[PDB]
């Protein structure tokens, strides 16, 4: 399926990452149905948009490694 | 979408009618309302359309190369 | 040999599956060929009709045998087996459609 994954969105030596739920066959910087999330590893926030991640994980788009690790920081996981 | 109402041109083919469809269109650079005609092949198993009647085209499964519509009847609210 | 082949390994397996699928699709063409052949004969000159259908049904069962068996292995999608079993029973329904079984919707 769809695989919720980051994409690099920034300058050189910056690493401002989006969390996009695109199809896994696409290149890493493509297009999404809905670009759900944010991750700034230098130091800043991470907007998550919980209902849409629950929509796609409720559908069954498995995430990658560190997207899943961000999803294990917060308490997003509910099986409903 | 909409149907495409228009006159029947010539029905000398079984289950098949040519239909002129008249369409107003704004010409792009100059702002008038130019008509463009485009004629189609529609399907009818009943083939109950003579020359000169006017029908409404609705999209269906393609029947031949050109025959991709079947036309039934307009509503007729005058 | 070389430490990495990776594609000649494919082409080896492609040669093998070419042999198997070529062969057993040809079996399907042979059994459908015999069914339509005997149906052509009993359309031509049979003169007793509701009796000898047991042979046509027997070979038609062998046709549905190898048809659906090659539907299991991946060489025929659904709506290939559907179209060709429907083809054989179109032909059977036509040979009975000329004659003594009377069928009307």
């Amino acid at each position: 399926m769809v695989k919720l994954r980051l994409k690099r969105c920034g300058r050189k030596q910056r690493a401002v990452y989006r969390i996009v739920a695109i199809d896994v066959r696409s290149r890493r910087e493509g297009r999404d149905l809905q670009k759900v999330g944010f991750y700034d590893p230098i130091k800043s926030q991470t907007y998550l948009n919980v209902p849409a991640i629950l929509d796609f994980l409720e559908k069954g788009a498995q995430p990658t490694e560190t997207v899943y690790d961000i999803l294990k920081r917060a308490e997003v996981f509910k099986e409903f | 979408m909409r149907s495409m109402q228009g006159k029947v041109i010539c029905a000398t083919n079984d289950k098949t009618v040519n239909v002129e469809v008249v369409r107003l269109a704004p010409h792009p650079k100059y702002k008038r309302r130019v008509r463009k005609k485009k004629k189609y092949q529609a399907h009818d198993p009943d083939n109950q359309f003579k020359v000169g009647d006017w029908v409404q085209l609705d999209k269906c499964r393609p029947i031949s190369k050109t025959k991709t519509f079947l036309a039934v009847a307009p509503e007729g609210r005058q | 040999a070389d430490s990495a082949a990776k594609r000649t390994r494919q082409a080896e397996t492609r040669r093998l599956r070419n042999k198997a699928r070529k062969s057993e699709v040809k079996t399907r063409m042979r059994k459908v060929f015999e069914a339509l052949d005997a149906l052509k004969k009993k359309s031509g000159a049979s003169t007793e009709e509701l009796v000898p259908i047991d042979n046509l049904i027997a070979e038609a069962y062998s046709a549905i045998d190898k048809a659906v068996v090659k539907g299991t292995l991946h060489r025929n999608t659904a709506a290939r087996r559907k179209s060709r079993l429907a083809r054989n029973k179109k032909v059977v329904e036509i040979h009975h459609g000329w004659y003594t079984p009377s069928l009307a919707p």
Partner: protein
């Protein structure tokens, strides 16, 4: 030209900005091969001996190009680098030759505006 039908046929179109250099036809300046290094005269109001090199180009044309500056090294069959720009006085000369580039030396002893003539700094 009414808005109706003499003009939703077409007005007309102007052609282009017509090319002011028919050679150089890719882009700005192009390597040349000297064929003649003769000298011609301008039209009637002027009076000079302007020294032009008729030059074959790498494009596929042959064209008579002007040689700027005072001194010139250009003998038969040398290599130059022509550029665009119309010398008015000479009928037919459409092009210039860059000085200081390949096999066409800079002008002798010039100390005002050297980048147009390919002379490095003194002092």
């Amino acid at each position: 030209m009414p808005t109706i039908k003499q003009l939703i046929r077409n007005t007309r179109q102007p052609i282009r900005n017509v090319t002011k250099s028919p050679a150089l036809r890719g882009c700005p300046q192009r390597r040349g091969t000297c064929t003649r290094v003769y000298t011609i005269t301008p039209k009637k109001p002027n009076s000079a001996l302007r020294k032009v090199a008729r030059v074959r180009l790498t494009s596929g044309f042959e064209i008579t190009a002007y040689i700027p500056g005072i001194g010139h090294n250009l003998q038969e069959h040398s290599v130059v680098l022509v550029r665009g720009g119309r010398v008015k006085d000479l009928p037919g000369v459409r092009y210039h030759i860059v000085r200081g580039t390949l096999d066409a030396v800079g002008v002798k002893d010039r100390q005002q505006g050297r980048s147009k003539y390919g002379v490095k700094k003194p002092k």
